[PDB]
Amino acid sequence: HSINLPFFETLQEYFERNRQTIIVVLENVQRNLKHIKDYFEKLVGFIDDAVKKLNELSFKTFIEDVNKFLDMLIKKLKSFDYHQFVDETNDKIREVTQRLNGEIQAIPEFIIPTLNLNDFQVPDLHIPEFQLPHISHTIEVPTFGKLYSILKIQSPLFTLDANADIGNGTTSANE
Amino acid sequence: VSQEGLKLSNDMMGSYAEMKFDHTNSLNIAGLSLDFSSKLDNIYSSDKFYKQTVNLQLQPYSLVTTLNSDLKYNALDLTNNGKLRLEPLKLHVAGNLKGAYQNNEIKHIYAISSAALSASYKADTVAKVQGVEFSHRLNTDIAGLASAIDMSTNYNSDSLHFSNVFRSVMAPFTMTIDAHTNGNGKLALWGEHTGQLYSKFLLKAEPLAFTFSHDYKGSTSHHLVSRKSISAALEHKVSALLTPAEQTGTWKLKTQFNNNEYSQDLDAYNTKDKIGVELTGRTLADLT
């Protein structure tokens, strides 16, 4: 169940108004700027990038994109492999050494071992992946349906079977 | 003393009856290098004596140190040897220590080296006393950063043999535990006591998700005097899958004493849809 409030609506409206006004101001700035040529083109490109990103931005979409990137990062981290990362680190160290040497000829070397540890052990368990339901300007609530108690006692001396159940009235929201 | 450098040599010889003391120290100075050697031997009797030998060599960008000493007391003996090589950023420490008295001897191995700014260490200790061996090994390549641990502890005896093996890694993000233990217990005081040990523990962890499981079986049978056949058979196994979206666990506990047994079945559930637990307490008991 999604919970939305008039405050959310006013927030989105004011956000849109402010974004529109700032886009107008940015367009004014860009036009004044347009009002060495490589540098001028670079400045125009910077202001254009600012305007484009400002137009793209929206609070709900912004939080959605942030959540998307966070989920991607979690998936990357959970699948992270130390052998692959160690090889990548060796690649980067070699790149740095090759660079610094290239500026020298155009200093002692730095080295990192090609370490591996999966050879000695490999996990046998299964780890479920991370799951985060998407995030928007609205609030989410899984409504409570029912609560029920099931009890059974078996013994020739005495027998009990007690049930206690209580739940929500979900017929309508107003009631 | 000369433009070449200082030279110092001294010898002090003293002896009478069983005692002979031969001491010499050779100290030479040459350029940017030092040479020294102190070879000292103190003989109190053929099987009762002390030997010390220290030899140090200093040269530009390298150190060499040798230490060899020997001690003997007829029925007892002790020997030790330690190598030390050091140069800029490279360390190599190795040697041996050995103490023995008749058959009962202890062997130790130590070797520490540092290369590529990563420190490696290996130690081996084995004791063999009165026909009982103890084999505990600390394995190689404990780096010190993003490190790993391996071990092998083994005790062997007629009444009991114990074997323990462990492996774990402390890499930046992911964690793992592989613990496996086995123990057989045999003891006869007031009847046979068969102490059996089955203990396995495994743990794996990673960002935003954790899981584990304990697997233990405990069984012990006691054939005590007075025809008492007592069997203690405890069996518990644990597990739980943990991560923010879904959470649950399980615990199987089986315990029994002779003809009386209890077993409980537990399953913990915590997920978006529901939370709940279920319990089944079943008992078997004797006596009126």
Swiss-Prot record, chain B:
It comes from the Eukaryota. The modification N6-acetyllysine is found at K274. This is Apolipoprotein B-48. It comes from Homo sapiens. The gene is APOB. The chain holds residues 1731 to 2018 of 4563 of the full protein.
